[PDB]
């Protein structure tokens, strides 16, 4: 089922980055930034999302806390949808 | 790229359920329950997760608030990983 494959893949990608070194359940925000920039390279903000997207991406670049857990990683994917996927163009 | 395909698919599934009727940006918890039970049918809790998984699923069955937005839907997927995916067995 498509969603099963997709959610397996989202764990796979987390494993790839979090498993590099140290705590296998945590990313640094620098690693999360790298992940999003490499693994979603083609995703760009929709016409009204630009400023929220820019604020989002700057926070990752500035913040260097390393307590990004799986749930926070998946939240970041969700936010990138709200910014970059046309379905949410007109969402509050 | 595998992640791009995956995250597109997660939006697709949301659209399928949220687009049925009413507000296309919202689910009811009943719809979220149906989604998880149908679309992740084969996923079951790891050895230590059973009680957290059961609490999670019961909350969906009892609660009939309809303010489940995309971010909450994706959070629910993440929680199901923590419960059901072996990577997180010892998390």
From Swiss-Prot, chain B:
<feature type="domain" description="EF-hand 2">
    <location>
        <begin position="48"/>
        <end position="83"/>
    </location>
</feature>
<dbReference type="InterPro" id="IPR013787">
    <property type="entry name" value="S100_Ca-bd_sub"/>
</dbReference>
<feature type="binding site">
    <location>
        <position position="31"/>
    </location>
    <ligand>
        <name>Ca(2+) 1</name>
    </ligand>
</feature>
<feature type="binding site">
    <location>
        <position position="91"/>
    </location>
    <ligand>
        <name>Zn(2+)</name>
    </ligand>
</feature>
<feature type="domain" description="EF-hand 1">
    <location>
        <begin position="10"/>
        <end position="45"/>
    </location>
</feature>
<feature type="binding site">
    <location>
        <position position="81"/>
    </location>
    <ligand>
        <name>Zn(2+)</name>
    </ligand>
</feature>
<dbReference type="Pfam" id="PF01023">
    <property type="entry name" value="S_100"/>
</dbReference>
<feature type="binding site">
    <location>
        <position position="67"/>
    </location>
    <ligand>
        <name>Ca(2+) 2</name>
    </ligand>
</feature>
<feature type="binding site">
    <location>
        <position position="72"/>
    </location>
    <ligand>
        <name>Ca(2+) 2</name>
    </ligand>
</feature>
<feature type="disulfide bond">
    <location>
        <begin position="28"/>
        <end position="66"/>
    </location>
</feature>
<keyword id="KW-0164">Citrullination</keyword>
<keyword id="KW-0862">Zinc</keyword>
<feature type="binding site">
    <location>
        <position position="26"/>
    </location>
    <ligand>
        <name>Ca(2+) 1</name>
    </ligand>
</feature>
<keyword id="KW-1015">Disulfide bond</keyword>
<feature type="binding site">
    <location>
        <position position="85"/>
    </location>
    <ligand>
        <name>Zn(2+)</name>
    </ligand>
</feature>
<dbReference type="GO" id="GO:0005794">
    <property type="term" value="C:Golgi apparatus"/>
</dbReference>
<keyword id="KW-0963">Cytoplasm</keyword>
<dbReference type="GO" id="GO:0046914">
    <property type="term" value="F:transition metal ion binding"/>
</dbReference>
<keyword id="KW-0677">Repeat</keyword>
<dbReference type="InterPro" id="IPR001751">
    <property type="entry name" value="S100/CaBP7/8-like_CS"/>
</dbReference>
<feature type="binding site">
    <location>
        <position position="61"/>
    </location>
    <ligand>
        <name>Ca(2+) 2</name>
    </ligand>
</feature>
<feature type="binding site">
    <location>
        <position position="63"/>
    </location>
    <ligand>
        <name>Ca(2+) 2</name>
    </ligand>
</feature>
<comment type="subunit">
    <text>Homodimer and homotetramer for the citrullinated form.</text>
</comment>
<keyword id="KW-0007">Acetylation</keyword>
<feature type="binding site">
    <location>
        <position position="65"/>
    </location>
    <ligand>
        <name>Ca(2+) 2</name>
    </ligand>
</feature>
<protein>
    <recommendedName>
        <fullName>Protein S100-A3</fullName>
    </recommendedName>
</protein>
<dbReference type="InterPro" id="IPR011992">
    <property type="entry name" value="EF-hand-dom_pair"/>
</dbReference>
<comment type="function">
    <text>Binds both calcium and zinc. May be involved in calcium-dependent cuticle cell differentiation, hair shaft and hair cuticular barrier formation.</text>
</comment>
<feature type="binding site">
    <location>
        <position position="84"/>
    </location>
    <ligand>
        <name>Zn(2+)</name>
    </ligand>
</feature>
<feature type="modified residue" description="Citrulline; by PAD3">
    <location>
        <position position="49"/>
    </location>
</feature>
<keyword id="KW-0479">Metal-binding</keyword>
<dbReference type="GO" id="GO:0005509">
    <property type="term" value="F:calcium ion binding"/>
</dbReference>
<dbReference type="GO" id="GO:0005886">
    <property type="term" value="C:plasma membrane"/>
</dbReference>
<dbReference type="InterPro" id="IPR034325">
    <property type="entry name" value="S-100_dom"/>
</dbReference>
<dbReference type="GO" id="GO:0048306">
    <property type="term" value="F:calcium-dependent protein binding"/>
</dbReference>
<keyword id="KW-0106">Calcium</keyword>
<dbReference type="GO" id="GO:0005829">
    <property type="term" value="C:cytosol"/>
</dbReference>
């Amino acid at each position: 089922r498509p969603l099963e494959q997709a959610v397996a893949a989202i764990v796979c990608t987390f494993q790839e980055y979090a498993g590099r070194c140290g705590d296998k359940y945590k990313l640094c925000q620098a690693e999360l930034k790298e992940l999003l920039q490499k693994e979603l390279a083609t995703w760009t903000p929709t016409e009204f999302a630009e400023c929220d997207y820019n604020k989002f991406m700057s926070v990752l670049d500035t913040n260097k806390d390393c307590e990004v857990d799986f749930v926070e990683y998946v939240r970041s994917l969700a936010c990138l949808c709200l910014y970059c996927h046309e379905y949410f163009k007109d969402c509050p």
